[PDB]
C-alpha cells in the first residue's frame, strides 16, 4: 500500500536484488528472478488503481518534456509486467497528445505559408519520428503509421482553422487567401460546412453586428467575408446561408 510511483518499485527491486550479486542463486539459463518480478509487477498493476493512474500521469509528463530514455524504460517495464495497461494504449495517447500540442504550437495563426501542413509534418517527423519508432520498436519505414499521422495532422489543421475562421476571413484577408484555397482541398462533409458557418456566424454576430460598431466598417468587413467565402466556396451556398 506504500507504492505510489515507479521510482518506488525500482528502489525496492534494487533493495531485493542487493544480496543477489553477493550470493548467486539464480541460474543464468533460467530467468526465474525475472518471472516473479513480472508477477509482482503484474499484480501491482492489476490491484493498485492509484499506482496505475500515477504511471499514466508520469508517462504523460515524461513524454511531454522529451525525456525519451526514461519513457523507453517505463514502456519496457510495462511490457515486461504484461498488465491490464498495455503499453500500446499509452504510446497512442502520448503520441496523440504530443502531436496535438506540436500542431497548436506551430500552425497557430500562421496563414501566409503555402503547403504548410507538409512543412509541419516534415518538421515533426525529423524531430520526433525516430524517437517514437524506437519507443514502439516498429521499423522506421512504417508507411501506414506515417499516413495515419499525416491524416491526424490535417484533421488538427482543419480543427484549428475552423476555430480561427473568423479572424482568418475578417482581418488577414486577402493575405490568408492561400490557406483558404488549401482549406478547400480538405473539407468534404456537410458537417464540416455546417460547423464552419455556425461558428463564423457566431463570432461575426458577436463582434460585427454590434450597433456600437461603425456601420461603414461593418459593411467593409462584411463584403470582405463575402469575397473570402466566395473564393473559399465557388458554389456560394454558404454565402446564401450567411446572407439569409
Amino acid at each position: 500500500n506504500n507504492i505510489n510511483y515507479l521510482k518506488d518499485i525500482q528502489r525496492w527491486e534494487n533493495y531485493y536484488e542487493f544480496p543477489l550479486r553477493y550470493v548467486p542463486i539464480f541460474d543464468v539459463n533460467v530467468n526465474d528472478w525475472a518471472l516473479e518480478l513480472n508477477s509482482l509487477r503484474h499484480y501491482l498493476l492489476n490491484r493498485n488503481i492509484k499506482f496505475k493512474n500515477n504511471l499514466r500521469t508520469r508517462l504523460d509528463k515524461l513524454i511531454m518534456d522529451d525525456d525519451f530514455d526514461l519513457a523507453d524504460n517505463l514502456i519496457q517495464w510495462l511490457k515486461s509486467a504484461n498488465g491490464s495497461l498495455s503499453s500500446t494504449e499509452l504510446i497512442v495517447n502520448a503520441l496523440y497528445s504530443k502531436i496535438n500540442k506540436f500542431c497548436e504550437d506551430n500552425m497557430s495563426r500562421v496563414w501566409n505559408k503555402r503547403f504548410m501542413i507538409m512543412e509541419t509534418f516534415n518538421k515533426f517527423i525529423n524531430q520526433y519520428w525516430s524517437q517514437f519508432s524506437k519507443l514502439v520498436g516498429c521499423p522506421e519505414d512504417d508507411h501506414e503509421l506515417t499516413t495515419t499521422v499525416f491524416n491526424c495532422f490535417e484533421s488538427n489543421f482543419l480543427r484549428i482553422r475552423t476555430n480561427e475562421i473568423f479572424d482568418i476571413c475578417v482581418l488577414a484577408y486577402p493575405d490568408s487567401k492561400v490557406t483558404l484555397l488549401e482549406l478547400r482541398k480538405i473539407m468534404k462533409d456537410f458537417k464540416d460546412y455546417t460547423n464552419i458557418v455556425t461558428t463564423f456566424l457566431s463570432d461575426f454576430k458577436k463582434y460585427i453586428l454590434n450597433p456600437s460598431v461603425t456601420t461603414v466598417d461593418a459593411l467593409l468587413r462584411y463584403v470582405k467575408t463575402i469575397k473570402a467565402f466566395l473564393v473559399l466556396d465557388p458554389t456560394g451556398r454558404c454565402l446564401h446561408s450567411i446572407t439569409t
Partner: protein, 74 residues
C-alpha cells in the same frame, strides 16, 4: 482519430466508471469476496483447481492472491 472527431464535434462513459471503481477483473473480485472471512477444504480444492486451470486468464493473479490469503499479514 475517429473518437476525437466525435469529441471535437474525460470521464464521461460508463467504462471509465467501472474502471474507476476498480472492479474490472471479474474473477479476482469474486475470489476476493469468497476468501473474505475459514477456507473450507471442499472449497479450497475448488479454488486450487482454479489456480491449476489448464487454460484461463489472470491465473497468476489468483495464485498470488491465494498466497496472500494463506501466508500474508493478518
Amino acid at each position: 482519430a475517429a473518437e476525437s472527431k466525435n469529441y471535437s464535434r474525460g470521464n464521461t462513459t460508463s467504462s471509465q466508471l467501472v474502471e474507476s471503481l476498480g472492479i474490472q477483473d471479474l474473477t479476482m473480485v469474486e475470489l476476493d469476496t469468497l476468501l473474505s472471512a475459514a477456507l473450507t477444504d471442499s472449497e479450497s480444492y475448488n479454488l486450487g483447481l482454479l489456480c491449476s486451470d489448464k487454460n484461463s486468464g489472470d491465473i497468476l493473479d489468483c495464485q498470488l492472491e491465494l498466497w496472500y490469503k494463506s501466508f500474508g499479514p493478518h
